[PDB]
Each structure stands twice: as C-alpha cells, then as structure tokens.
Amino acid sequence: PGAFGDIQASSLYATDIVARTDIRLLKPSVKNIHVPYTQAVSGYEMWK
Amino acid sequence: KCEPSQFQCTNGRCITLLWKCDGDEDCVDGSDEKNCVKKTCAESDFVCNNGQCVPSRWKCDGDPDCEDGSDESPEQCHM
Amino acid sequence: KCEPSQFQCTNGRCITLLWKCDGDEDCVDGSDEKNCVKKTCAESDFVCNNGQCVPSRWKCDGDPDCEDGSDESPEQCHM
Amino acid sequence: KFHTVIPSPQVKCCGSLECKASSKADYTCRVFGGVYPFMWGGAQCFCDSENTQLSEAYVEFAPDCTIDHAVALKVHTAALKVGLRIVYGNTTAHLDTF
Amino acid sequence: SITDDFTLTSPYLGFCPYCRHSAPCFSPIKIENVWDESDDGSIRIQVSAQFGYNQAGTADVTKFRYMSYDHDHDIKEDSMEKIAISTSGPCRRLGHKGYFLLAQCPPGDSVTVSITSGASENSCTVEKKIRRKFVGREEYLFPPVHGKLLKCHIYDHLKETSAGYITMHRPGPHAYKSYLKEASGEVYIKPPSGKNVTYECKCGDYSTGIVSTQTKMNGCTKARQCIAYTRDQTKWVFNSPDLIRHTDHSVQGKLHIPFRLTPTVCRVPLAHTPTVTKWFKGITLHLTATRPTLLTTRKLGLRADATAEWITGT
Amino acid sequence: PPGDSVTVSITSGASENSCTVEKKIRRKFVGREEYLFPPVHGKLLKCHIYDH
Amino acid sequence: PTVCRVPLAHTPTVTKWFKGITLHLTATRPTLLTTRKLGLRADATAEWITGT
Amino acid sequence: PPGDSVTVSITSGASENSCTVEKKIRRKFVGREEYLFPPVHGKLLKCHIYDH
Ligand SMILES: [Ca+2]
Ligand SMILES: [Ca+2]
Ligand SMILES: [Ca+2]
Ligand SMILES: [Ca+2]
C-alpha cells in the first residue's frame, strides 16, 4: 500500500483486479447513516 | 455519572450534549426533548392553536390530531 | 503521409487538426470543411429554407441568392 | 489511480449480519454492534440497541484510467537491426538487416 | 446494457459535509466525486440531483429535477440558471447531463455547487485540491498565441460521449416520523391520504402489515418503537453511500458518464532562444525566462551524467 | 474567510459608504490535526465559540 | 464552552525490530506526532508531519 | 487589488465579451515601512501618482 503498483490487473477491462490499499472501516459515531473509513494515499499519485 | 460535556438521561445512559434540545428523541424516555425552551416551527410544520407543532398535512384529514382538535375544526378547513 | 495529429487534404498538404471543421476553407479544395455535420448558424446568419447558412443582409437584395430562391420570395420580404 | 467504491449500507433492525467473502479487489467488510441510524425523516429501525449495520468498501478502476495509466514490462535481451546506404560504382542501394 | 432513458431513475438526498450554514445536513445537492484529469483545467462533478431533464424524466436542457424535502417523497423541477459552481471564484459551466456537471474552475481548495435563489437556496462543499495544470516543459498561465502544438487530453465538451458507467440499484426503504401519531398512550399510523403504507413494530412482539387508513395498533406505548414507509416507489437510484440499501441490491441498469477524456492538440510557449558562449571543452548558456522553464542535458558517451533544472529569471 | 482586513459597508442607498481596518484574520483549528471544516466523523473535543 | 468535532488520523502501521519501532504515517493535512520515553529522562519530540 | 492578470469586460448587453493579458500586479508602498494602506498619522514623504 502507498506505493506504485498498489492496484494491478492483467488489462484495463479485466474482471480480476487485485489491490491492497490498506482500507480501514471505523465505528459510526454520528446519528445519521454513515460509512466512515480511511485509506492510504494513491500509490500511483505518489509515484507520479 | 459522566463527564459534564455529556448529558445523562433519566435511564442510565450518557449521550453527547449536541443531542440535547435538537428536535430528536434519543433517550429511551425522551428526557432530552421536553426540557429546553425551544419553540420554533418549520414552514411545513403548522402550529396548532394549543401551541404544539404538528405537520401541516395532518390538518383536516378526518380525524382529530391536536389536543383540542383544531385540525378538524370547520373554521380552519371549509367543507 | 503525416502523423494523425494533422489532417491531410486531398492535395498532398497536411494541416493541424484545429483547422478541421472550423467554418474556414483551409485546404486548396475545401475538403477539410465538407466532411463534418456542423449545422449551427450565427445570429446574423439567416438560415435558408434549404438549410444553407447565409448572411441576413443577403436576403431579398434584388437577385436570387439561395438555391431555392427563397431570398427573393415576397413572403420573406414584402414589397 | 484507484477509485474507492462504498456501496449503500445494509442494516437489520433486530438481527445479525455476517461478513461474506467476495472476489472484488481489497474487499473489506465489518459488522457493528448497535447503531440506531438516522435518515431524513427520523429513525429507520424500531429496536433501540439490537440495530446492526454492515459496511463494505472495495476498489475499482477510475473512469479516466483509460488514458492516464501505466504498464509494467519485463524486458529481455535486446536485438539490433540497422539500415545501410551501401554504394559502389555509380549504383546505390538501401536495405535493412539484423 | 447501458440505458439512457432517465424516466426510470430519480434523484436522491445525500449527506453534504458542509451545507449553506456551515454544518453537515441532508441536502439534495450532495457532491459525490470530483474528477480533475484534463489538461485544460476543467473538472467533472457528480451531484445527487439530475440536470437536463424535467420532472417527468424526459429530456429538457433548461430544467433540472431534484428531490423535495416533503415527506411524500416527491420530485420537484426548477429552472436551471439557478445553478452555479464555484471554488474560490465563479466557475464557467460547460456541459451537463444526468448526475454530472462539467465546469472550468480557477485554482482553489474546495469545490462548491449551489442553488443561488428560489425556495431551496442551498449549497454543498467538498474538500478537493484543484491546482493549475500545464502541458509541456514550460510553465504558462494561459495558452499563448504563438507556439508549437503538443499532445494533450481534455474533457470533451459534448454530452454524448462516454467514459465508463455507474450502477443503478433499487430504492431502499425510507421511513418518515410524520406517519406516527402517538395520541395519548397508543401509537397510530396514518397514510399520506390515498397511499398504501407498511409498518413494523417491536412492542413486545414483532408486528408488520400494510395499511391504507387509520390504525389503532396494539401493545405499543411509545412512537419510537415503530416505523412506517411506502413501497410504491420504483425508480432506481445511484449506489450512494448515504442510503439504506434494499433487500435485493442487485444491479438494475447502467448510466453513461459523460464528457469522456479525448486526445487533442494544445498550444505551448516557446522560450527565448539561448545564447551560446563557446570556450575550451565547455559551453556557457545565457538563459532568460519569465516563468519557470526546464533545461535538461545529457552526454552522448558511455557515461550519461544527466541534469534537470527548472531555470527561472535571467 | 481568511483575510487581511475587516470591512463593514452599506451596499445600497443614499448613504452608501464603507469602512476598513487592518486586522489579521487567520484560519483556526481545534486540536492536533489541521482541517478545512469539521469532518463528518471524528472524536469530540472541548472548544469555545461565540454564542449566536 | 462547548464541543467541536475533530478528525481522526489514519492509524499508523508499526514495524518492530530490536530495541526500536518504525512508524508508517500518512496524512493529507499537517498532523502532530509527539513521543516521550518513560524513563528517568524524557527525550520529548514534536513534529508536524504531512504526506507519506 | 494584487493579481496575476488584468481583465476588461462588458458585463451585459448583446456584445458581452472579455479580454485578459498576463501581467503581474503587486502591492506597492512608499518609504521604509511596509503597510496595507496609508495610516491616519505619520510623516509625509514624496511619492508619484497618476492624476485622476
Ligand atoms: Ca435529543
Ligand atoms: Ca386533520
Ligand atoms: Ca476548416
Ligand atoms: Ca436577396
């Protein structure tokens, strides 16, 4: 996670993408419906 | 007890203070609503003659809604 | 030939793609204009009955100008 | 560049939700104990504490990746090919050879 | 199969982190994603509202439909000139279709889509770092009049292009507290005039049914232990992260993402031609540049000591 | 918003004037993490604000 | 006095080695990171960390 | 005000256009003490201004 190649696929339209971006799901706190989460930065952006 | 930034309902629960006087019932017995002095009513909430805030569509629907039944009064809605 | 970035007229000369379908005769024969389907007209560009984009002042100037001759028609310009 | 996808949450009023395996990229799922969520219109479930919410989040390809994308390559031994302008007498020739 | 018949869809209510009054609140103009990959600065904005259509769902360039605040789950339409986009200053609007807007914006730190006037004069803001972009090896502020042509990619202004698709799912349940009466000690349910509404309760036992009139209801003392919602809505809705999903969250259709990225040619400045001073086994370059420009050198031998500097000034 | 001066003005009418004073107004944040606006999800800290 | 809402940073990932740990931190906006030993002397540090 | 370009425009009417040229406009001041606008009290220096 957080570096080049964090998401890979055999082709653009392949259906077997595999990635590891360090997704973390958090416990909701506010009353209204929500899906709080956090993630590593885009490794592609970092490499660029 | 809980830290003063959290209000304690009369049931055994402590919630954050932003939920007090917010128009929504969060305590199981509704202790965080009928305690403050807020009296505002939205545009869609018609204010009954008794002062209670009731949705406008409730008015003159064929059944009494307010305590005195102002909604079913022929004065308010003419048949 | 030339790179795809520049369109090639039917003469042997390549011009940049920005001049393709811009309302301006760029190639020596104008082949760069008679290939797209642009049909908009300006505010001062009257649209003839055949769809040709012609100047508004060109209308009813005493001699036929459009293919169908709608410019000199009495309906468009009463005498 | 990836584009995170967070599907609409699923909630059960008085029940239990269980994670299920999926083949999507970096599929991550969790189940939370008591929520009592709100929407525009008030509460959505009747149980005061037995409310269960399930969160999902996987990763897909960004819509603009069809142009801004990179390709990884492994390169073996390089082969060399040249073009020549061999001349002799009053005759010239052009040819390519490896 | 990607469909373009918008009559089968409908807008929805997102959860904007920053409403007009600088506080999170439910809004009809929630920003979902903001994409900026064009080389000319334009951006693509996804919004929970629908632009370029009337209430019935047919095509109409001048009107946009959105979800009303009323409890009857109704869709309202309005003239489109009320809609504006801004980051730090006003943004020039370019195209619009469905959930998506295409606007050109100056540099800023947040993207805001707002309704200027009318009954619903709301706003929505999402953090996003919009920065000035340029193509080539020489910085500029707008494309100059004279220069060479490079290869650049810009968002197509036409609204018939496609750059992918987005799923469309069945609408979820949506309970409204306005359906609960709680007269004295008993919870009453009233449908919104002539509609069929379902109810669920857990007043000691699990109770569920469909009613179309007043219901006394049994065993319930508090309004908070019952819910009521309608089921005759059938228009699909985006896969939003702010909606309770239906029991069957299977994809029902797909929608085009307009303004595909296309290759074209941009114009870039030519720097002032440097002056070369020649000495023994070395040259000296006299450079001038009003804006940062790139100068790279490399030897032609086995060793290739490479330099790369952003010269500015003189 | 952040700025370098504070201006009060009467927009329209016969007495249309303005006033300005030099005052540095900077973006303020609470806690140990810079942010643009209060995020939807997070912990609650203790802060002081002017009463509306 | 009242309560505000403040962001929670991305939880770091610790890499453990002999007599020392390594933190892998990500932060889109400046964030504070302080450390202090629990011994007789405390080598307190403070740093505003941005980026990965 | 300071900026990086200068623009002349015709706001309304049929001929609604605009023009813009690259030009650096920076805040200027006289003397040896920077300021935002002429303060109420101070000594008088020699400057040059375009005649209205
Ligand atoms: Ca409350
Ligand atoms: Ca009534
Ligand atoms: Ca042309
Ligand atoms: Ca004529």
Swiss-Prot record, chains B, C:
Changing W58 to F/R: Complete loss of entry of Semliki virus into the cell. It is found in: Cell membrane; Membrane, Clathrin-coated pit. Disulfide bonds join C2-C14, C9-C27, C21-C36, C41-C53, C48-C66, C60-C77. Changing D65A: Complete loss of entry of Semliki virus into the cell. Residues 1-38, 39-79 form the LDL-receptor class A domain. Changing D63I: Complete loss of entry of Semliki virus into the cell. Abundant in heart and skeletal muscle; also ovary and kidney; not in liver. Glycosylated. Changing D61A: Complete loss of entry of Semliki virus into the cell. It comes from the Eukaryota. It is linked to Cerebellar ataxia, impaired intellectual development, and dysequilibrium syndrome 1: An autosomal recessive, congenital, non-progressive cerebellar ataxia associated with disturbed equilibrium, delayed ambulation, intellectual disability, cerebellar hypoplasia and mild cerebral gyral simplification. Additional features include short stature, strabismus, pes planus and, rarely, seizures. Multifunctional cell surface receptor that binds VLDL and transports it into cells by endocytosis and therefore plays an important role in energy metabolism. Also binds to a wide range of other molecules including Reelin/RELN or apolipoprotein E/APOE-containing ligands as well as clusterin/CLU. In the off-state of the pathway, forms homooligomers or heterooligomers with LRP8. Upon binding to ligands, homooligomers are rearranged to higher order receptor clusters that transmit the extracellular RELN signal to intracellular signaling processes by binding to DAB1. Homooligomer. Binds to the extracellular matrix protein Reelin/RELN. Interacts with LRP8. Interacts with LDLRAP1. Interacts with SNX17. Interacts with DAB1. Interacts with PCSK9. Interacts with PAFAH1B3 and PAFAH1B2, the catalytic complex of (PAF-AH (I)) heterotetrameric enzyme; these interactions may modulate the Reelin pathway. Interacts with STX5; this interaction mediates VLDLR translocation from the endoplasmic reticulum to the plasma membrane. Interacts with CLU. (Microbial infection) Interacts with protein VP1 of the minor-group human rhinoviruses (HRVs) through the second and third LDL-receptor class A domains. This is Very low-density lipoprotein receptor. It comes from Homo sapiens (Human).
From Swiss-Prot, chain E:
Palmitoylated via thioester bonds. These palmitoylations may induce disruption of the C-terminus transmembrane. This would result in the reorientation of E2 C-terminus from lumenal to cytoplasmic side. N-glycosylated. Disulfide bonds join C16-C124, C19-C25, C91-C105, C152-C266, C201-C226, C203-C220. It comes from the Viruses. It is a single-pass type I membrane protein. Glycans are attached at N196. Residues 1-314 are extracellular. It is found in: Virion membrane; Host cell membrane. Interacts with spike glycoprotein E1. Processing of the precursor of protein E3/E2 into E2 and E3 results in a heterodimer of the spike glycoproteins E2 and E1. Spike at virion surface are constituted of a trimer of E2-E1 heterodimers. Interacts with 6K protein. The E2-E1 heterodimer interacts with host PCDH10 (via domain Cadherin 1); this interaction mediates viral entry to the host cell. Plays an essential role in viral attachment to target host cell, by binding to the cell receptor PCDH10. Some specific strains may also bind host receptors VLDLR and LRP8/APOER2. Synthesized as a pE2 precursor which is processed by furin at the cell membrane just before virion budding, giving rise to E2-E1 heterodimer. The pE2-E1 heterodimer is stable, whereas E2-E1 is unstable and dissociate at low pH. pE2 is processed at the last step, presumably to avoid E1 fusion activation before its final export to cell surface. This is Spike glycoprotein E2. It comes from Western equine encephalitis virus (WEEV). The lineage of its organism: Viruses, Riboviria, Orthornavirae, Kitrinoviricota, Alsuviricetes. The chain holds residues 320 to 633 of 1236 of the full protein.
